[PDB]
Structures are given as structure tokens and as C-alpha cells.
User: Which sequence fits this backbone?
């Protein structure tokens, strides 16, 4: 008999605080109310760079409340953007958790990102080409390295039981929460800050993904552009975000008087070995990530009330994920695709969506998937649409997938 | 509580290794060269050195450049770390006898410091010159830092997870740690793991040397890298990449693979001290070593050998000596391979894990080069002068990284 959360072979792990910054709001509770009210964070892009380059994509969700409005003079000169976002969210989360005094030697941080401080690579490159090697900042390395945001949070909050950065492109944010769960259940930590951060919409990221022919170009109706699972979808839309949650053993939470929002029960990680940038059509390995999360949780597929889909609104992505949900035996779950409203934040998105999964369990409600108007027969899923779907949801799986063939599924439960 | 010794974790063995280094593309020749006291560190002849008059004019390029093995298409459609990952993954698999494994039980975990960053700057220049439609359609998949691990997973058919842990100079060891976790948690029976890294270039040298941590002993390049020596003056770049194949002992026995060593346990901690200096007290670094022992089921008295991260910076080696004391491992024989091979950043912990395996397999530790004046603050048994033979049974490989990351791996003789 394998250990599971249900059989007590793993310790119970609970989510005790959440924080996120999104295109709708810097306040996760206001993001959540806005989603439930059918709001979209997607807008016409007004940036100069759009007109400068005449970009084919002219839509996206910038953060409602820009990170750098909270940054001091020295932060702007000593950290890359994902580090600044990490420091902002790290401090917000800790305050939301009641600023607890925890044992630093039992406290881990696991934060994913898609790339790291890449703007400082191009900065350094230009500085050196113009003025030679002594023009490169002595801080360049530490601003650039992709583990930089996780390290800044570890330093800020004092985590001494490991600081890790898993990178798996668009599944990085969920993968980080999986590895944090593992670190606790293996006995390496009792409490962990985890999730994901990502850079803002800029011209070069738009250019590179646009050349994969991946992106929606419904520029005339920005809030209608992102249409996961809909027959008429035409690709993904960027929406900025960063998100963190605090997880800890149930015993640890109870000893300090924390009130859990949900339980994090198990995590599955698999890979397709199919193609570098398309998911396997059959959804079999993706489905097996979901199944592995259920095995570690001790659940059956019939237990799962809700799936928070990766749902990017590409034609081949959504079709693969529908197959994966069928493989896992989860296709009678109520499905939400939050990128319909919040867009795609790449290395942060799995973390944001994990936070939304937690709030669905806490509050008994799934927001409507925006723009879901014409069901697609290849996609026979129960996609929540039109108005929120209320229920006493007991268990839910959050899915995230990434270029490279990475599949991550996280199983959460109502507390 | 489970340990390897108590049977609570399955037994995991190392069954193949590959590496490319500044001494040789052939790990067995690297090893022979190390034992004979060879250095891979040379004067750098690159035009970029004189173009920028770099303060640092030494390092070790790969003896056999990755791209001498690469087709025209790969040169345009993979980043350098992807090309290195493809070359090494193919070599490792052939060395392992090209086994037919269950893909759904096979994982890949490969760390790197940065990823396909030359494609970032190239995409930036191409767009600045010609607009957004000049950026390659393959740019994202070449740039993404999971790119090398993903290339190897697709090449070899791994469907039980492809992971890229990033922890700067400890990434290559951290990859092997997480591969070990993936197998003992039951998610895989076999894994390819290790680390790749880019080559020495002008901008990397400028960025590290502006931190003031690099040796500039340009007069005597083979003498420059002096871990634990009293006169050390900073680290030296030495290119590498390394992968190993690990699998359950049951899996290896079933296919007739002869183990090279056992991978017994892994410890990961962090300092929360400074972004680019290790904690002077060595406490959390020593606890990484202690955790690898706890998971192995070993005590510090059992350890014969420590393969030190040993970068040759003044404050780095002092902190590590403290760490080895905190862990109770300071009676062990110490080797600092960066003395001969220099520092390969994201790859280096993987390379040094392969060297730890070979020490255990062959009963010998190479001499730490350039170790001439003991430093009283260090007070370690640094193997030097000639290789040291012995019946080594248990060894710890240490790796640390910017951000305060500490990774220790506990290996045993098979
Ligand atoms: C939801 C969006 C997600 C996008 C994800 C992309 C991930 C990349 C990380 C984003 C980059 C951070 C930028 C933050 C600072 C900032 O904004 O810099 C502006 C001006 O522009 C720049 O410096 C642009 C510099 C670009 C840096 C290189 C980016 C390369 C992108 C690749 C070519 C394509 C994407 C690779 C993704 C790989 C991983 C995921 C699969 C300062 O403005 P000012 O204050 O000077 O007026
Ligand atoms: C042991 C060394 C370790 C170094 C580690 C540094 C990280 C390496 C990053 C990958 C480097 C890949 C380079 C391969 C391409 C190549 O070689 O192309 C040259 C031409 O130059 C270039 O393109 C240089 C391109 C610059 C790339 C950006 C590098 C940014 C470096 C950062 C500012 C500093 C390092 C940050 C490290 C953070 C992570 C670890 C803490 C031949 O051109 P040709 O023969 O075709 O004419
Ligand atoms: C191996 C490839 C995969 C999983 C591709 C996916 C489904 S992941 C992702 O977020 C998107 C939209 C583009 C950012 C894909 O096209
Ligand atoms: C937190 C900082 C740490 C651990 C710094 C170390 C000791 S790790 C490393 O390889 C080097 C040499 C620079 C490549 C350090 O200076
Ligand atoms: K999701
Ligand atoms: K080492």
C-alpha cells in the first residue's frame, strides 16, 4: 500500500495565504470578484512599441497596478523585473499570512519563471558593445540568473530549507507548487512560499510568439479574443500576472492559528516526448499527470468536481487537453479556463490558476469561462459559461502544460 | 523514517556517465588526465580577449568543441546548450548499451545556469535591424531554459517528467538530486540527469569579472585555479557538460547493467544570507551534507571523501571548510577538481558528481592542483601532489550557487 494523503502516508498540507497581481487588480480578492462578475483584463495595447513595430498583435492585459510603482530607486537599479515582482508579492503574501515567525530552517521557497531577468541580458550586451566590459554592472549576473526571483524572496523572508526554481516554460508556476509540496511531504520543510512570476508584455516577446503563429489577432474586440474551448478560438492572448501561495503542514498551521483556505493533496509531473512546442494530441501523458496527482492524494477520478484547465485557446492545445481530461476519467468535472479573462502569463500562469482553484474550493463557485459561445464537438467538456457555477466542490485538479512537453497537475481539496 | 540503508527508499545506482571537458571529450581520458596531474586551463586565444582587452585572459575551452559534431540544421535551430545536450544524451545512451526502457518510467532532469541566451541577443538584434517578422519561429524553443532538458527528453523518449532546476552554480548537482527524488518517490525507475552550460565568451567573462571574483593570474594559466591554497585569488572558467544514467538497482539488474556506484541520498538547503556570498559560518551548507547523510542512512564518521565545490575564491573556500566541519566530515580526504577543470557554472556539479562516481569505482582521488601552501583557516586533508589510492566506500559531492543554494549528494561504492 503506497503512501497517499488520504491514508496518512503523507502529512496533510494546507494553503494558508494567497497573493496575486493581475490585469484585473493588484488585490486577489478583487480579481476574484471581477472574474465572478464576468470582467476581462484584456485591452487594446496602447504602448508606443505597438505602433513603432506595427505589431500584428495589438491586444493583451497589462497589470492593473504596475509593479514598479511600488519599487524604490535602488530596487530599480539592483533587481531585474521578475525579482522586483518577486519582492513585491513576497512581502504582500507574508503580511497576508499574519507576518508569522517561522523556523527558517524548516521554511522553503519554490518560485518558477519562464526566462528570468532577460532585459538585463540585452542591457548588459548593449552597454558592453557601446563602452566595453567595464560598463557591465557588477550586479548583472545576480539580476539575470533565472533563480534570481526565488532567491530574492528567500533572502527577503529568511527561508533556509531550500530555494528552488523549476523551469518548464508555461507550466513553471504550477511545477513550483508541486516541488514545494514534495519538499514538505519528504520532510525537508514544514512551510513553503511557492508560485511563479513573469515579465511584462513587450515587443520582443510578442514578436517571438507571433512568429509561431500561436496568438489571437482579434484586435478589434480585445475582451472577446481569448476563447478557450470555443469553436472559433484563434490562439492565446498575453495577460500579465504573478502569484504566490503559502503552504504548510496542517499541524504547523494549527499551532500558529492560521486558517487554511484549502488543502494541497498531491501533484503529478509527466512529459510527452512528442514535440517541442505542440502537446501530444492523444492527451495520454497529460492525463497521466492528473492521474498521478490523484494517486498521491488518494482520490478517484469520480471524486474530482472541478478542473481548472490550462485552456490557452489555441486550436491544438485545447483539443489535446480535452483528450487528457478524458484519459484521466475527469471529463464529468465542471471545467473553468481562466485565460479566457486573465490571458496567459507564461511562467506565472500555473501559480495564478492554482490560486484561483483554491478560491473555487474556499467559496464554492467557478467563474464563467468568457467568450464560450459555440461548443466544439472535439471538446465535449462541461465548460462553465454565462454565469458562475455554484456547488459544494470537494476536490479539484489544476492543469498546466509547457513547451518541451511538460505536464503538471495539482490536486486540491476543500478545507 | 525512510533511508536508503534501512530499505525505506529503493536502492538507486549509477550505470553510465558521459562528459565533455577542457581535457578531453572522453570522460575516461579526462579521468586519466586528472590522475596524471593534467590541467585543462590555457591562455585564451580568442580574438574577443584582445578586442576588449579583458582583464581575465585564461580559461579552459572544451578540448573537442561541441559544434564539430553538429549538422548545419542544428546549428541554426538549437541553442548551444541544446546542441551540447543532444551530443551528450546520445553519447550517454550508447554508453549504457542503448537500452529499451519503459518510456513512462523514464525521466530527464538537466540543470543549466541560463539557457539559450545567445538566441536572446540574436533575436534582439534581428528585430532591431529588420522588425518583428525577422525573429526566428524557433526562437522561443531555443531560448527557454528548459530547452536542453526537453531536447534530451524528446531524443531519448522520456515520458515520466523532464525537469530543469536552476540554482546557478549548483544546478548540475541539484538536477541529480531531483532525479534521485523522482525515482525514490516512485515516479520513475530510470533517469538521465546532469548539467550543461555555454562556452567561455566575452560578455560572460565581463559580467563575472566585474564582481571581482576571478583569478587574473594570466602569466601562468595552469597555476591560476588554487582551491584551498593560501594564495588563491579567485575562480577560473573551464567549460564542461556532464550527464549520468541512474536507475533502481532492480531495473539495472533486470537489463544486465553493471553499476558504477550507488546514489544514496541528496540534501538541499539555502543560506538566506547574501545573494552572491556564501554564509561564512557554513551552517546551512553543512546541513545540506547532513541531510544527504540522513536520507542515505549514513553517519558523518562513515564518510571517506568529499568532492569540494572548491572554487578558489577567498571567502568561498573558507565558508566550505566551515561547512564540512559543521557536517562532521572534516576527517574525510578532500578533492577540489576546479583546480584542474575550472568552473563550468550550471554544469559543474554534474561533472563533479561523475568524478565522485569514478573515485568510488576506481579507489583513487586525483591530486588537487596548485595546492602548495596550506591555509590555517581551512585545516582540511586536501589530497595533493599525487593521486591518493584507498578503499573509498562513501563520498559527498558538494555544490553551491549564487542565491545561497546548497546541494550535497551522498554516493557509495557499488
Ligand atoms: C504576460 C507577458 C509574458 C511575456 C513573457 C516573456 C518572458 C521574457 C521576460 C520579459 C522581459 C522583461 C522585461 C522587463 C523590463 C521592461 O519592461 O523593459 C522595458 C523595455 O523593454 C525591454 O527592455 C525589452 C527587453 C527584452 C528582453 C529579452 C526578451 C526575449 C524574449 C524572447 C526573444 C522570446 C520569449 C522567450 C520565452 C522563453 C520562456 C517561456 C516559454 C523597460 O522600459 P523602460 O522603463 O526602459 O521604458
Ligand atoms: C565555462 C563558461 C561558463 C559561462 C557561463 C555564462 C552563461 C552562458 C550563456 C550561454 C552562452 C551561449 C553562447 C553560445 C554562442 C556562441 O558561442 O557564439 C559566439 C558569439 O558570441 C555570442 O554569441 C555571445 C552571446 C552573448 C549571450 C548572452 C550571455 C549573457 C551573459 C550574462 C550577461 C552574464 C552571465 C549570467 C549568468 C547567469 C547564470 C549563472 C549564475 C561565437 O560566435 P560564432 O562562432 O558563431 O561567430
Ligand atoms: C509541448 C507543447 C505545449 C504544451 C504547448 C501548449 C499547449 S503550453 C501553452 O501554454 C500553449 C500556448 C502558447 C503560450 C501551448 O501551445
Ligand atoms: C551565495 C553565494 C555563493 C555560494 C557563492 C559561491 C561560493 S558559489 C560559486 O560557484 C562561486 C564562484 C563564482 C562562480 C562562489 O562565489
Ligand atoms: K489551469
Ligand atoms: K564538488
Assistant:
Amino acid at each position: 500500500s503506497q503512501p497517499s494523503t488520504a491514508n496518512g502516508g503523507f502529512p496533510s498540507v494546507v494553503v494558508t495565504a494567497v497573493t496575486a497581481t493581475t490585469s484585473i487588480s493588484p488585490d486577489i480578492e478583487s480579481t476574484w470578484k471581477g472574474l465572478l462578475a464576468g470582467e476581462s483584463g484584456i485591452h487594446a495595447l496602447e504602448d508606443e512599441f505597438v505602433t513603432k513595430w506595427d505589431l500584428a498583435v495589438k491586444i493583451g492585459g497589462h497589470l492593473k497596478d504596475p509593479v514598479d510603482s511600488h519599487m524604490g530607486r535602488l530596487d530599480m537599479r539592483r533587481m531585474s523585473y521578475v525579482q522586483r515582482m518577486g519582492k513585491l508579492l513576497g512581502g504582500q503574501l507574508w503580511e497576508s499570512a499574519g507576518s508569522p515567525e517561522v523556523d527558517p530552517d524548516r521554511f522553503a521557497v519554490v518560485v518558477g519563471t519562464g526566462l528570468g531577468g532577460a532585459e538585463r541580458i540585452v542591457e548588459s550586451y548593449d552597454l558592453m558593445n557601446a563602452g566595453g566590459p567595464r560598463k557591465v554592472s557588477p550586479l548583472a549576473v545576480q539580476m539575470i540568473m533565472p533563480n534570481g526571483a526565488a532567491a530574492v524572496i528567500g533572502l527577503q523572508l529568511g527561508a533556509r530549507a531550500g530555494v528552488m526554481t523549476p523551469v518548464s516554460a508555461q507550466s513553471s508556476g504550477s511545477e513550483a507548487i508541486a516541488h514545494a509540496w514534495r519538499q514538505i511531504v519528504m520532510g525537508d520543510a514544514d512551510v513553503a512560499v511557492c508560485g511563479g512570476v513573469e515579465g511584462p508584455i513587450e515587443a520582443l516577446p510578442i514578436a517571438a510568439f507571433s512568429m509561431m503563429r500561436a496568438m489571437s489577432t482579434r484586435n478589434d474586440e480585445p475582451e472577446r479574443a481569448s476563447r478557450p474551448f470555443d469553436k472559433d478560438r484563434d490562439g492565446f492572448v498575453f495577460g500579465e500576472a504573478g502569484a504566490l501561495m503559502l503552504i504548510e503542514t496542517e499541524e504547523h498551521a494549527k499551532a500558529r492559528g492560521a486558517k487554511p483556505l484549502a488543502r494541497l493533496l498531491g501533484a503529478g509531473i509527466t512529459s510527452d516526448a512528442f514535440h517541442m512546442v505542440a502537446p501530444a494530441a492523444d492527451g495520454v501523458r497529460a492525463g497521466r499527470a492528473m492521474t498521478r496527482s490523484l494517486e498521491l492524494a488518494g482520490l478517484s477520478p469520480a471524486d474530482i468536481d472541478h478542473v481548472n484547465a490550462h485552456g490557452t485557446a489555441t486550436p491544438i492545445g485545447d483539443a489535446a487537453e480535452a483528450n487528457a481530461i478524458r484519459v484521466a476519467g475527469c471529463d464529468q468535472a465542471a471545467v473553468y479556463a481562466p485565460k479566457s479573462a486573465l490571458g496567459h502569463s507564461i511562467g506565472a500562469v500555473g501559480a495564478l490558476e492554482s490560486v484561483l482553484t483554491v478560491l473555487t474550493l474556499r467559496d464554492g463557485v467557478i467563474p464563467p469561462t468568457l467568450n464560450y459561445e459555440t461548443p466544439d464537438p472535439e471538446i465535449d467538456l462541461d465548460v462553465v459559461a454565462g454565469e458562475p457555477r455554484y456547488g459544494d466542490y470537494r476536490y479539484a485538479v489544476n492543469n498546466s502544460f509547457g513547451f518541451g512537453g511538460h505536464n503538471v497537475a495539482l490536486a486540491f481539496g476543500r478545507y
Q: What stands out?
A: The first helix of chain A runs from residue 28 to 36. Chain A touches chain B through 83 residues (CB under 8 Å). The domain at 1-265 of chain A is CATH 3.40.47.10 (Peroxisomal Thiolase; Chain A, domain 1). Chain A has two domains: 1-265, 266-415.
